[PDB]
Symmetry: C3
Subunit: 230 residues, 3 copies
């Protein structure tokens, strides 16, 4: 409780926990093989984020990084979280439009570079270098977003209407929510330090819960995840 951001970490933990249990129970009994894949992927995302939010709450996922003449608290657990949950979110989208194996590999690899370089930037001690890593990480994200539009949107329009409809919604949700992440990093404690840590934690918590639980609520209520059968 000595950390003013603790309230936002406690709430994020609870929402990810509650999201995980809901998806887990809703997924009971689903026999359709296709739907089970989406339930498996989408329930795993908040389970992972739950454990990492708890580690931040309890103080484990925190470290001090000297830069700018001060010791700055850096929650490295966020990057462990994103390293495993962001490729799962992209897999949900790719399996929806039945993307080829080469495009999937491109997306997951670019995603691993995005999060990995963001982690290096967060732990870098030379101030100016942190923004070099931020730029490479942001470059990788632009590739992802380009694929989701001028690489995926065309394949969805040649499939069942419920798939094209649900993909377009989740695509739009993804592009909006993902693009906010590099901004909060840059003006927050990891970058320019304009926004205090307790408010940055609040902002990441809203985005994290929307992009994981909110994403899952939309997808798992759709007919797109079920095969077309009689």
């Amino acid at each position: 409780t000595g950390r003013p951001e603790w309230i936002w970490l406690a709430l994020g933990t609870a929402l990810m926990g509650l999201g995980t249990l809901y998806f887990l129970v809703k997924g009971m009994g689903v026999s359709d093989p296709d739907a089970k894949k989406f339930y498996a992927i989408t329930t795993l995302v908040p389970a992972i984020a739950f454990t990492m939010y708890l580690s931040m709450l309890l103080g484990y996922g925190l470290t001090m990084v000297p830069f700018g003449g001060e010791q700055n608290p850096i929650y490295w657990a966020r990057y462990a979280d994103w390293l495993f949950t962001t490729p799962l979110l992209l897999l949900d989208l790719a399996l929806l439009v039945d993307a080829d194996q080469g495009t999937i590999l491109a997306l997951v690899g670019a995603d691993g570079i995005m999060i990995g370089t963001g982690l290096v930037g967060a732990l870098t001690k030379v101030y100016s270098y942190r923004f070099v890593w931020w730029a490479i990480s942001t470059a990788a994200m632009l590739y992802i977003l380009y694929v989701l539009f001028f690489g995926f949107t065309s394949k969805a329009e040649s499939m069942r209407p419920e798939v094209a409809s649900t993909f377009k919604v989740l695509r739009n949700v993804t592009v909006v929510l993902w693009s906010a992440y590099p901004v909060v990093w840059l003006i927050g404690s990891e970058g320019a330090g304009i926004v205090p840590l307790n408010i940055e934690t609040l902002l990441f918590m809203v985005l994290d819960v929307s992009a994981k639980v909110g994403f899952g609520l939309i997808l798992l209520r759709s007919r797109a995840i079920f095969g077309e059968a009689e």
Copy 2:
């Protein structure tokens, strides 16, 4: 030799080494594509554990963690070992009953959460928190065990008798041997400290060798791993 547990680490190293060479030689010449998959998965498990046991023997896979007012030796290499070998063991079982891709993902993800949270619990410095992680890790294991019974056992009974027979044996071996791990952790040096480190090392060594080499001897002598062909 200054560590009394060294004898159990030297023996575990030798048994994993010897297990690896046996499986490797036995796997020579096997042309059946199905059998080669099981040989590949099952020989990799003791190769990985061999390298990590050796690192513990040589003192690399060891660190000191202050908690309870003392410096406690923690063999972190065990979790690196289990992180890579336990999903391979589950893959052996899943491919046997030809489980769907969504169930496989659920098992491997839950398994990664189980080992990952066990690692955090082992390195946690606040005593009471170590058991919070132990509980989350144990919760993930119960999900795995539930899948192996009320998720897999039903699919094996609808397949070739030799597959149903071999799966049931390996399932039973797995549930018994895996369930002992959380107990040794709790009463051992990582938890309550009731059992001394040298005896905990002995107990993990017996379980490790049984669940990896013993598991492999049963599976790789079975007809289930071979396709049904003339």
Copy 3:
């Protein structure tokens, strides 16, 4: 610029960057599903190595390891690089000859053991033990090389001539370039220290660029990556 090897790190960074952009642009528009897989795998290899070379250039991927009575600079970022790029290189070869899933798993697992044990050897503080890890790592490599000859070369000769032709070239390139890595390690700063660090950096840079960009130029100009169609 206080590190004499910086020139070789700056050049390696540039060549991996330039290699990545070339493959990325050349891969634009390729619609053939098979070719897209190879373009995806092969463009990812220099993208990863670019980021790790940059981390070495900027001083992040460097640490000091006491052994032999001195503090020795160890670029641990090389192993992070190789951990992710070497299995991708092997996947390029395996998909070319359409290898079975069990052989692929064997190659990637043996490759992960090779790099992982090389990392432990590099960070080991007991001098004699560094060569124990070097030997296990080299043993795993011999298994890989054996598979590429007496495991793959036979499957390529039963396929389209352009595949057999391109595989044989890339196989030969791989065996020659990979086998040099354990030698430079042994006589370089990580081992016997006969060759100074600045020259070891030069040697790894030539090998790294040849085995990644050079490899990719040969493969991606071949007809083998395209399906046979009218």
